[PDB]
Write a protein that binds this ligand. Structure first.
Ligand SMILES: */[SH]=c1/[nH]nc(-c2cccc(Br)c2)[nH]1
Ligand code: NA
Length: 309
């Protein structure tokens, strides 16, 4: 019916971590020293907030299932889980944070080469999730992390659903949903496909090309479906040639099958990335430049160079 999932879930002991500092609020940053391996791995630890909630633990372990089952350079991977009172996911440290905050903070230093390269990397991540019959359902600039300015990865598998062997669409049943990133068929009929992820990819690319503007800003979510039905779409960003904007608009077609495939978005953004100043017009583009303190950094290895059978 479907291939067995032989991914390994690694259970890590509390004695393998040296939690250096705290990131957010319960988000933490630290080092993972696998039991006698002479390696230190920078990690982000997501430890449980409420901690009292059986519902919270079901959801955290669903995320861990998906993150443990993915292996791609443009997708965040789970190093393992810590089975203490609060169930923690241990993940690779992405030291520059979310791409949304990164484009807001560094507008003045982001050239066309970075922007179009990010678009290719996200399309590659999303194409890999499709090969794995996985629908993300929450693609947004906030859910892409920056390992380096040259290297981003898709994250937040909180809404991710594995399509059934014979189930092309997933049918959801209510909650707090990200309306402004969602395909029309998802807002109306709670239908979700690879093609509805493409719609979200479009909105994500618009966030990047506007240096992190809020889509349909100051419009309440209740009217978004009506606006889209009338045929309104997000406006052409100033830096965007019609070439780039036409690709975004195709991601926002009402016929889901008329939207591009992730594999096509890889091709189209790659061609544009070979001649970036022809596709994005940014003031001062040719000038733009983009790039921790623990006692001993000698045995530090990035998770991406730390592989296990
Ligand atoms: S690749 C990766 N590293 N950190 C994270 C992460 C941080 C905070 C929230 C989530 Br869902 C993931 N993933
Ligand atoms: Na979506």
């Amino acid at each position: 019916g479907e291939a067995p999932n032989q991914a390994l879930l690694r259970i890590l002991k509390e004695t393998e971590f040296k939690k250096i500092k705290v990131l957010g609020s319960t988000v933490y940053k630290g080092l993972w020293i696998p039991e006698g391996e002479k390696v230190k791995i920078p990690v982000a630890i997501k430890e449980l907030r409420e901690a009292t909630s059986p519902k919270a633990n079901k959801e955290i372990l669903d995320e861990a299932y998906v993150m443990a089952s993915v292996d791609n350079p443009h997708v965040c991977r789970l190093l393992g889980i810590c089975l203490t009172s609060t169930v923690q996911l241990i993940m690779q440290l992405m030291p520059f944070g979310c791409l949304l905050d990164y484009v807001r903070e560094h507008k003045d230093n982001i050239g066309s080469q970075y922007l179009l390269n990010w678009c290719v990397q996200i399309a590659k991540g999303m194409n890999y999730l499709e090969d794995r019959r996985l629908v993300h359902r929450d693609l947004a600039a906030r859910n892409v992390l920056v390992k380096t300015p040259q290297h981003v990865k898709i994250t937040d598998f909180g809404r991710a659903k594995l399509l059934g062997a014979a189930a092309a669409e997933y049918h959801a049943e209510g909650g707090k949903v990200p309306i402004k990133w969602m395909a029309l068929e998802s807002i109306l009929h709670r239908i979700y496909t690879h093609q509805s992820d493409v719609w979200s990819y479009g909105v994500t690319v618009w966030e990047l090309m506007t240096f992190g503007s809020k889509p349909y800003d100051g419009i309440p979510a209740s009217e978004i479906s009506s606006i889209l039905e009338k045929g309104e779409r997000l406006p052409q960003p100033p830096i965007c040639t019609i070439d780039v904007y036409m690709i975004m608009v195709k991601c926002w077609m009402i016929d889901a099958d008329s939207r591009p495939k992730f594999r096509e978005l890889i091709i189209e953004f790659s061609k544009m990335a070979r001649d970036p100043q022809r596709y994005l017009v940014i003031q001062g583009d040719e000038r733009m430049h983009l790039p921790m303190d623990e006692e001993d950094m000698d045995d530090v290895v990035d998770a991406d160079e730390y592989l296990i059978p």
